[PDB]
Design a protein around this motif. Structure first.
Motif, mmCIF file in Angstrom:
data_model
loop_
_atom_site.group_PDB
_atom_site.id
_atom_site.type_symbol
_atom_site.label_atom_id
_atom_site.label_comp_id
_atom_site.label_asym_id
_atom_site.label_seq_id
_atom_site.Cartn_x
_atom_site.Cartn_y
_atom_site.Cartn_z
ATOM 1 N N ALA A 192 0.800 -1.217 0.000
ATOM 2 C CA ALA A 192 0.000 0.000 0.000
ATOM 3 C C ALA A 192 0.837 1.274 0.000
ATOM 4 O O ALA A 192 0.263 2.369 0.030
ATOM 5 N N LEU A 193 2.169 1.157 0.000
ATOM 6 C CA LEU A 193 3.028 2.338 -0.092
ATOM 7 C C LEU A 193 2.625 3.249 -1.246
ATOM 8 O O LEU A 193 2.603 4.477 -1.099
ATOM 9 N N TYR A 194 2.304 2.669 -2.404
ATOM 10 C CA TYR A 194 1.942 3.437 -3.590
ATOM 11 C C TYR A 194 0.474 3.848 -3.603
ATOM 12 O O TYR A 194 -0.117 3.992 -4.682
ATOM 13 N N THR A 195 -0.133 4.041 -2.430
ATOM 14 C CA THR A 195 -1.525 4.468 -2.320
ATOM 15 C C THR A 195 -1.661 5.657 -1.376
ATOM 16 O O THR A 195 -2.697 5.826 -0.728
ATOM 17 N N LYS A 196 -0.614 6.495 -1.286
ATOM 18 C CA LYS A 196 -0.632 7.643 -0.394
ATOM 19 C C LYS A 196 -1.053 8.903 -1.141
ATOM 20 O O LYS A 196 -0.738 9.068 -2.323
ATOM 21 N N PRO A 197 -1.773 9.809 -0.471
ATOM 22 C CA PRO A 197 -2.189 11.050 -1.149
ATOM 23 C C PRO A 197 -1.021 11.925 -1.567
ATOM 24 O O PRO A 197 -1.048 12.509 -2.657
ATOM 25 N N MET A 198 0.008 12.036 -0.721
ATOM 26 C CA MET A 198 1.174 12.836 -1.080
ATOM 27 C C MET A 198 1.899 12.242 -2.281
ATOM 28 O O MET A 198 2.386 12.977 -3.148
ATOM 29 N N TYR A 199 1.974 10.911 -2.353
ATOM 30 C CA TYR A 199 2.593 10.267 -3.507
ATOM 31 C C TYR A 199 1.813 10.556 -4.782
ATOM 32 O O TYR A 199 2.406 10.841 -5.829
ATOM 33 N N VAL A 200 0.481 10.491 -4.713
ATOM 34 C CA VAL A 200 -0.340 10.779 -5.886
ATOM 35 C C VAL A 200 -0.173 12.232 -6.309
ATOM 36 O O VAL A 200 -0.089 12.541 -7.503
ATOM 37 N N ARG A 201 -0.109 13.147 -5.338
ATOM 38 C CA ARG A 201 0.066 14.561 -5.657
ATOM 39 C C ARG A 201 1.416 14.811 -6.320
ATOM 40 O O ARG A 201 1.508 15.534 -7.322
ATOM 41 N N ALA A 202 2.480 14.214 -5.775
ATOM 42 C CA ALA A 202 3.805 14.383 -6.360
ATOM 43 C C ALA A 202 3.876 13.774 -7.754
ATOM 44 O O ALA A 202 4.493 14.348 -8.659
ATOM 45 N N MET A 203 3.240 12.617 -7.951
ATOM 46 C CA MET A 203 3.233 11.990 -9.268
ATOM 47 C C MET A 203 2.461 12.833 -10.275
ATOM 48 O O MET A 203 2.878 12.963 -11.430
ATOM 49 N N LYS A 204 1.342 13.427 -9.851
ATOM 50 C CA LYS A 204 0.584 14.299 -10.742
ATOM 51 C C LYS A 204 1.388 15.540 -11.112
ATOM 52 O O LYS A 204 1.392 15.959 -12.277
ATOM 53 N N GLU A 205 2.081 16.136 -10.138
ATOM 54 C CA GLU A 205 2.907 17.305 -10.433
ATOM 55 C C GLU A 205 4.048 16.950 -11.380
ATOM 56 O O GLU A 205 4.349 17.704 -12.314
ATOM 57 N N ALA A 206 4.691 15.801 -11.158
ATOM 58 C CA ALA A 206 5.772 15.375 -12.042
ATOM 59 C C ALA A 206 5.256 15.104 -13.449
ATOM 60 O O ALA A 206 5.917 15.447 -14.435
ATOM 61 N N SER A 207 4.076 14.491 -13.562
ATOM 62 C CA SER A 207 3.490 14.252 -14.877
ATOM 63 C C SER A 207 3.179 15.562 -15.585
ATOM 64 O O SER A 207 3.444 15.706 -16.785
ATOM 65 N N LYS A 208 2.614 16.531 -14.859
ATOM 66 C CA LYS A 208 2.345 17.836 -15.452
ATOM 67 C C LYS A 208 3.631 18.493 -15.939
ATOM 68 O O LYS A 208 3.673 19.052 -17.041
ATOM 69 N N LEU A 209 4.695 18.422 -15.134
ATOM 70 C CA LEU A 209 5.963 19.026 -15.534
ATOM 71 C C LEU A 209 6.543 18.338 -16.765
ATOM 72 O O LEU A 209 7.037 19.007 -17.682
ATOM 73 N N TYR A 210 6.495 17.005 -16.805
ATOM 74 C CA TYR A 210 7.032 16.284 -17.956
ATOM 75 C C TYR A 210 6.230 16.577 -19.218
ATOM 76 O O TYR A 210 6.806 16.736 -20.301
ATOM 77 N N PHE A 211 4.902 16.661 -19.103
ATOM 78 C CA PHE A 211 4.090 16.985 -20.272
ATOM 79 C C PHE A 211 4.345 18.411 -20.745
ATOM 80 O O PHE A 211 4.403 18.663 -21.954
ATOM 81 N N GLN A 212 4.515 19.353 -19.814
ATOM 82 C CA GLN A 212 4.823 20.725 -20.208
ATOM 83 C C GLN A 212 6.184 20.808 -20.891
ATOM 84 O O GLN A 212 6.351 21.543 -21.873
ATOM 85 N N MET A 213 7.168 20.061 -20.384
ATOM 86 C CA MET A 213 8.483 20.045 -21.016
ATOM 87 C C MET A 213 8.416 19.435 -22.410
ATOM 88 O O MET A 213 9.008 19.969 -23.354
#
Lengths: 235, 838
Positions: B581-602
C-alpha cells in the motif's frame, strides 16, 4: 474527536510526519519500522473519527454539504493532506514504547522503556497523552509482565514535567548531563510497575469531593430490566 | 591454477572478519601477476563498493561478469556476486547467482535462507515455498524454521498443512519452552488463530471448534485485546448476542476511549433502529465514564427532538468552555461536515447566550475560548470581517496565545493575503522559540507566500548544521516530503509568473521611444537565469519521494529474517500490506501528478521550440560578444563570475552529496531524451502494478495515455469512471469532447484506433453526445456543455482550458464563463486561478 487504538504500520510514515511537528530529534524509517515490528503490543496511536449524523433526512435537508466530498456528486477521493489517514480520520498523536533487548552483562529483567510520546500541541489539555501512557503501561503489565518502567524527560518543557512527575506521578532516578543533540540536561525517571494499581476501571473519575459513588462495570446490566418503550422507568 | 586459489582462500578470512585494506592489498598483489582471475576481481568489486567507491567497483564487477563464459566455477565467487547484487538493489541477478552456486555444490544450507529472503522481496512464492521447506528440513533445531514454513504455507494456500505442522510442533515441544519464549509462543498462537480464521468461513462446526480452541488457549495467550476482538467476531458470526455484548463491555472496560468498540456494540445489540434505547444506553454509560468524549459525542448523531438536541449540545459544550480546550471547534468539526442549517444555528444561539452572561475580567479564559470558537464557526461559514474583529478583540484581551496568531494567519491566507499572514505568524513564532509545529507552519505559509529564501532561513535553525551552510541536507536526511512539495509549488508559481512578465514586456515591442526596456536588460536576464535554475532544482527535488519510497521498500532486507527469528508473523503480514500500500498515499499521488504535469509541459514546449520561427543563426548568437571591445576577455570574466556564483548557490542549496549525484544544477533532467519512457518505467509501472479498484485516478491515466497513441485504455478508464462516479459530472463530458476531437482525421495518429474508438462510442453511448457533428464547424460545444452539465463545475472548465489547443471551442468566451462561474467560491482560489490557471 479523540480515538485511541493500536499503532498500525500502514500509517507510520504519517506518524513520522507528526515527529516533524513535535520533537526535533527525528528518526529514520528503519528506526520506526523496527520499533513497530518488534513489539506492536506497546506503541499506541490517537486519531480522529467521523461517522454518520442524520444523512439526507427531511429536517433542514441540504445536498450541498461538505463531508470531504462524499454527499452528492463531487466524486469520492481523499483530500490532499499528509495528516489524513482515511476520508474522515486523521492522526493527532502517538506513543512509541520499546523493550530492553541490548546486552548489558548483568542479566536485566524485562522492563518497560518509554521511547517517545508525541501529541500535536494544538490538540492537548483534554486527556490524550495520559490515556495513552496508562493504556501502554496496562498492556505492558498484562502481556510482557514489566517489572518497572524507565523514561527520560527534559527541563524547560513544563507540560511534560506536569504530565510525568505530577499527573502520572513518576519518581526521578538520575540526572543525565548532555544527552540530546543541543547539549541540554535531562532527567531519567524510574517507577516500579504493579498489576493492582494500573487498572483503567480504577481511574474512571478525574476528581472527587470527599465520598462519592464510584460505579464500575460488573456482569450483566444493559440486557436486564425490560424494553424502554412502555415500562415504569421509560422516560 | 594452484597458488592463486591458496592465496584467495588465505585472503577470504580478511573479508570474513573486519579487514578491508589488507584484503585489497592481497587482491592487488594477485592481480599484478595474473589479471584474468575472476574470483579476485569479484572480491575487489565488492570491497571497493563497501568502502565508498562506486564507479571503480561497478567497473570491476562488469569486468568480472564479462570474464565469465559458462556456469562452472568456485561457489565463493557466485556468493560474492550475489551479495553485491543484493547490496546494489539487484534481486533477480542475485537469485540467479545463488541458484547457480547452490547447483554446483555448496555445503552451506544458510545460503538457501538468503533466497528465502530475496524472492520474498519480489513476491515469487512458488520457489520460496520450496526454499523454506529445504531450509526447514536442513536444520531442525530452531523455531524460526517452523515459523517461516507456517507463513509460507499460509500465504500460499496450504492452510490444513500449516495447522498440522503447528500442531505437531506444539506436541513435540510441549513443556520445553523458556520464559522469554512464552510471549513469542503466544504470538504464534494468535497467528494460528488467524489461520483458523481462514478456516472459519460460515460453517457452524468450524466456528464452534475455533471458539473452543480459543477458550482453551486463552490461559496461555498473553495478548488479550486481539483475543477478545476475535472472540467478539466469532460471537457475531454465530448468533450469541449476550456473550458478544459481555465481550464488548469488557473491551470498553479495558479501553473506553474507542469509537470502534462502541459502534460494534451498537451493531451487536441491534438497537440502531430505535433512538430511545440508544439514548438510555448512552445516558447510563455516561455515569460510568464522566471524563471520556465518545460517550458524549456519539449521542449527538441520532437525536430528532430539537429541545433534547439543544440540551445535549449545551451539556457537551459547557465543560469544554469551562476547562478550555484548544480543540472545541475540532470537537464539532465532523458534525459541521454533516449538519448545517439545523445544528449550527442552535449552537450559535447557545454560545451567544453563554457569552452574554460572562465577563472579560471575572472569566477571561471562558471569554477568550468563546471568542476563539465564534471566530472558528464564522470562518467555517465563509465569514471574514467578523472573524477578524473577533480575533483582534481576542488579541487585545490576551495576546499570549499562539492559536490566535495561527487563526489570524489562516484567515489572511483564505482572504488572499499570504505575505501579511506570514509576517504575523513569524512575529507570533518569535514570541517563543521552542516549538517545531509553529516553525513548520510558518515555513509552509512562507512557501505559500512566494518567499523561499526567508522560509529556508527560518527552517535552518533546529536542523543539524555540520557540512553545510544551512539545514537542507538535514531536512533531506530526516525523510521529509511536505516541505519539498510546498517548495516545489512555490518554484512552479515563480516560474509561471515569469511567463506573464515576459508577455507584458514583449507586449510593448519598443513602442515609439521605449529605450527604458532596452537599456535595462542585464538584471532581467539574471532574474530569468535564476528562475530557470530554481525551476531545474525543483525538478531535481521532485526525484526524491519516489526514490525515498523505493529505498523504504528495499530496506526490508533483514526484516524477512527478523520477523521469523523474533517470531512476529502478524507483524510480517502487516509489513507486507504496508509495502503493497506504499503506492496508495495522497502525497505520492500529488507528487506523481505534479511530475506528470511538468514532464508533459516540457515535452510540449520542447516540441514547440524544436521547429518554429526562422533564422537560427540570428538567434543562437546570445551574448558574449561586443564586437571591437575585447569580447574574449569579457566572455571569460562573465563565465568566471557565473561559475563563482553558481558554486556558492549550489553550496547553499546543497542536499545531495557530490560523490552520489553529479546532476546538481539539474540541466540534464530538464533536457532529457525520452521523458515519457522514463515516466512510464520509473513513476507509472509501480502505480499500475500496485493499485486497488475504487481508488484509482482516471484523469491522470487519461492524460498519460492520450499522448502515447493508445486510446483503448482511455476508453476503458472513461467507461469505468462513468460506471462508478455516475455520468452526471462535467469531467465525463469534457473527456468525451476531448476524445471526440482527438479521433478526428486531422490529428496525426492511428486511423485504426480512431475507428475502433468511434465504433465503441457508437455502440455504448448513442443517446448522450452527438457523434455526427465532427464535420460541422458552426456547432458550439460550450453551449451544449453548459446546457447539459452546466457551467457550475470548476474541474471541467479547468480541464477544458488546459486542453484547448487540440479542442477548438473558443478561448475568450470560455475565460469569461470561467470568471463568471468562479464567483461563488473563495477569494484566494479565485486569485490563484486568475493569476496562474488562467
Amino acid at each position: 474527536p479523540i480515538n485511541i487504538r493500536r499503532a498500525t504500520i500502514n500509517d507510520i510514515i504519517c506518524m513520522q510526519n507528526a515527529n516533524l511537528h513535535n520533537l526535533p530529534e527525528n528518526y529514520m524509517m528503519k528506526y520506526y519500522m523496527y520499533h513497530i515490528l518488534s513489539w506492536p503490543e506497546a506503541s499506541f496511536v490517537a486519531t480522529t473519527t467521523t461517522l454518520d449524523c442524520e444523512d439526507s433526512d427531511e429536517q433542514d435537508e441540504n445536498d450541498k454539504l461538505e463531508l470531504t466530498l462524499d454527499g452528492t456528486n463531487d466524486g469520492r477521493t481523499i483530500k490532499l493532506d499528509p495528516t489524513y489517514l482515511a476520508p474522515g480520520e486523521k492522526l493527532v498523536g502517538y506513543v512509541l514504547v520499546k523493550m530492553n533487548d541490548d546486552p548489558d552483562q548483568q542479566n536485566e529483567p524485562p522492563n518497560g522503556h518509554i521511547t517517545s510520546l508525541s501529541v500535536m500541541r494544538t490538540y492537548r489539555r483534554m486527556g490524550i497523552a495520559e490515556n495513552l501512557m496508562r493504556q501502554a503501561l496496562f498492556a505492558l503489565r498484562e502481556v510482557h509482565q514489566a517489572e518497572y518502567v524507565s523514561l527520560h524527560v527534559r527541563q524547560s518543557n513544563r507540560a511534560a514535567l506536569h504530565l510525568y512527575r505530577d499527573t502520572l506521578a513518576f519518581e526521578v532516578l538520575s540526572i543525565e548531563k548532555s544527552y540530546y543533540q543541543d547539549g541540554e540536561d535531562a532527567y531519567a525517571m524510574k517507577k516500579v510497575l504493579k498489576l493492582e494499581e494500573l487498572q483503567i476501571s480504577n481511574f474512571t473519575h478525574r476528581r472527587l469531593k470527599e465520598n462519592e459513588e464510584k460505579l464500575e462495570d460488573d456482569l450483566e446490566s444493559d440486557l436486564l430490566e425490560d424494553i424502554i418503550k412502555q415500562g415504569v422507568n421509560d422516560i | 591454477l594452484k597458488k592463486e586459489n591458496d592465496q584467495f582462500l588465505e585472503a577470504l578470512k580478511l573479508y570474513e572478519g573486519k579487514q578491508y585494506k589488507k584484503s585489497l592489498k592481497l587482491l592487488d598483489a594477485i592481480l599484478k601477476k595474473d589479471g584474468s582471475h575472476v574470483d579476485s576481481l569479484a572480491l575487489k568489486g565488492l570491497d571497493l563498493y563497501s568502502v565508498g567507491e562506486k564507479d571503480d567497483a561497478a567497473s570491476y564487477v562488469a569486468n568480472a561478469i564479462r570474464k565469465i563464459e559458462g556456469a562452472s566455477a568456485s561457489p565463493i565467487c557466485c556468493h560474492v556476486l550475489g551479495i553485491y547484487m543484493r547490496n546494489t538493489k539487484e534481486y533477480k541477478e542475485s537469485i540467479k547467482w545463488f541458484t547457480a552456486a547452490l547447483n554446483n555444490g555448496s555445503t552451506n544450507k544458510q545460503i538457501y535462507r538468503d533466497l528465502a529472503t530475496l524472492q520474498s522481496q519480489i513476491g515469487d512464492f512458488k520457489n520460496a515455498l520450496v526454499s523454506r521447506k529445504k531450509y526447514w528440513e536442513a536444520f531442525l533445531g530452531y523455531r524460526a524454521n517452523w515459523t517461516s514454513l507456517a507463513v509460507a504455507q499460509d500465504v500460499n494456500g496450504e492452510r490444513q498443512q500449516a495447522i498440522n505442522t503447528l500442531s505437531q510442533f506444539e506436541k513435540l515441544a510441549e513443556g520445553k519452552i523458556s520464559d522469554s519464549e512464552k510471549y513469542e509462543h503466544s504470538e504464534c498462537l494468535m497467528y494460528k488463530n488467524d489461520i483458523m480464521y481462514k478456516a472459519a468461513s460460515d460453517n457452524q462446526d468450524k466456528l464452534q471448534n475455533v471458539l473452543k480452541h480459543l477458550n482453551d488457549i486463552e490461559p496461555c495467550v498473553f495478548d488479550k485485546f486481539g483475543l477478545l476482538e476475535r472472540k467478539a467476531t466469532i460471537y457475531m458470526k454465530l448468533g450469541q448476542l449476550k456473550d458478544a455484548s459481555i465481550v464488548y463491555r469488557t473491551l470498553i472496560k479495558r479501553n473506553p476511549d474507542n469509537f470502534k468498540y462502541y459502534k460494534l456494540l451498537e451493531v451487536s445489540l441491534g438497537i440502531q433502529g430505535d433512538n430511545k434505547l440508544k439514548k438510555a444506553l448512552y445516558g447510563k454509560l455516561e455515569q460510568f465514564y464522566p471524563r471520556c468524549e465518545p460517550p458524549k459525542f456519539i449521542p449527538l448523531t441520532f437525536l430528532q427532538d430539537k429541545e433534547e438536541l439543544s440540551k445535549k449540545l449545551r451539556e457537551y459544550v459547557l465543560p469544554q468552555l469551562e476547562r478550555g480546550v484548544p480543540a472545541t471547534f475540532s470537537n464539532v468539526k465532523p458534525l459541521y461536515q454533516r449538519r448545517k442549517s439545523k445544528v449550527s444555528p442552535l449552537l450559535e444561539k447557545i454560545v451567544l447566550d453563554y457569552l452574554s452572561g460572562l465577563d472579560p475580567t471575572q472569566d477571561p479564559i471562558p471569554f477568550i475560548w468563546t471568542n476563539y470558537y465564534l471566530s472558528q464557526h464564522f470562518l467555517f461559514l465563509k465569514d471574514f470581517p467578523k472573524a477578524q474583529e473577533y480575533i483582534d478583540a481576542a488579541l487585545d484581551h490576551t495576546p499570549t496565545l499562539v492559536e490566535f496568531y495561527i487563526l489570524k494567519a489562516r484567515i489572511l491566507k483564505h482572504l488572499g493575503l499570504m505575505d501579511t499572514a506570514a509576517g504575523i505568524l513569524e512575529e507570533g513564532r518569535q514570541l517563543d522559540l521552542q516549538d517545531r509545529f509553529i516553525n513548520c507552519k510558518t515555513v509552509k505559509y512562507f512557501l505559500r507566500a512566494n518567499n523561499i529564501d526567508k522560509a529556508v532561513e527560518v527552517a535552518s535553525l533546529f536542523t543539524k548544521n555540520d557540512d553545510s551552510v544551512n539545514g537542507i541536507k538535514d531536512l533531506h536526511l530526516v525523510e521529509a516530503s511536505w516541505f519539498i512539495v510546498e517548495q516545489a509549488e512555490a518554484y512552479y508559481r515563480l516560474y509561471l509568473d515569469r511567463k506573464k512578465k515576459l508577455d507584458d514586456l514583449a507586449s510593448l515591442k519598443k513602442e515609439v521611444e521605449s529605450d527604458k526596456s532596452e537599456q535595462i536588460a542585464n538584471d532581467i536576464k539574471e532574474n530569468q537565469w535564476l528562475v530557470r535554475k530554481y525551476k531545474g532544482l525543483a525538478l531535481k527535488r521532485f526525484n526524491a519521494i519516489p526514490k525515498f519510497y523505493k529505498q523504504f521498500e528495499d530496506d526490508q532486507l533483514d526484516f524477512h529474517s527478523y520477523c521469523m527469528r523474533k517470531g512476529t508473523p502478524r507483524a510480517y503480514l502487516e509489513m507486507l500490506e504496508w509495502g503493497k500500500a506504499l503506492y496508495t498515499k495522497p502525497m505520492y499521488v500529488r507528487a506523481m501528478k505534479e511530475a506528470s504535469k511538468l514532464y508533459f509541459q516540457m515535452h510540449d514546449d520542447r516540441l514547440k521550440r524544436k521547429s518554429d520561427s526562422l533564422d537560427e543563426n540570428s538567434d543562437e548568437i546570445q551574448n558574449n560578444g561586443q564586437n571591437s571591445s575585447s569580447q574574449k576577455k569579457k566572455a571569460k570574466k562573465e563565465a568566471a563570475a557565473m561559475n563563482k556564483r553558481k558554486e556558492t548557490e549550489a553550496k547553499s542549496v546543497a542536499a545531495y552529496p557530490s560523490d552520489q549525484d553529479n546532476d546538481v544544477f539539474g540541466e540534464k533532467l530538464i533536457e532529457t531524451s525520452t521523458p515519457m519512457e522514463d515516466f512510464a518505467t520509473e513513476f507509472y509501472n509501480n502505480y499500475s502494478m500496485q493499485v486497488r479498484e475504487d481508488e484509482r485516478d482516471y484523469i491522470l491515466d487519461f492524460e498519460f495515455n492520450y499522448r502515447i497513441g493508445k486510446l483503448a485504455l482511455c476508453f476503458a478508464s472513461l467507461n469505468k469512471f462513468a460506471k462508478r462516479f455516475g455520468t452526471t459530472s462535467g469531467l465525463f463530458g469534457s473527456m468525451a469532447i476531448v476524445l471526440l476531437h482527438a479521433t478526428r482525421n486531422d490529428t496525426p495518429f492511428d486511423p485504426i484506433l480512431k475507428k475502433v474508438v468511434t465504433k465503441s462510442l457508437e455502440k455504448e453511448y448513442s443517446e448522450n453526445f452527438p457523434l455526427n457533428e465532427i464535420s460541422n464547424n458552426s456547432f458550439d460545444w460550450l453551449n451544449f456543455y453548459q446546457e447539459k452539465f452546466g457551467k457550475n463545475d470548476i474541474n471541467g472548465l479547468l480541464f477544458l482550458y488546459r486542453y484547448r489547443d487540440d479542442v477548438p471551442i473558443g478561448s475568450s468566451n470560455l475565460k469569461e464563463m470561467i470568471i463568471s462561474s468562479l464567483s461563488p467560491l473563495e477569494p484566494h482560489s479565485q486569485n490563484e486561478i486568475l493569476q496562474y490557471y488562467l
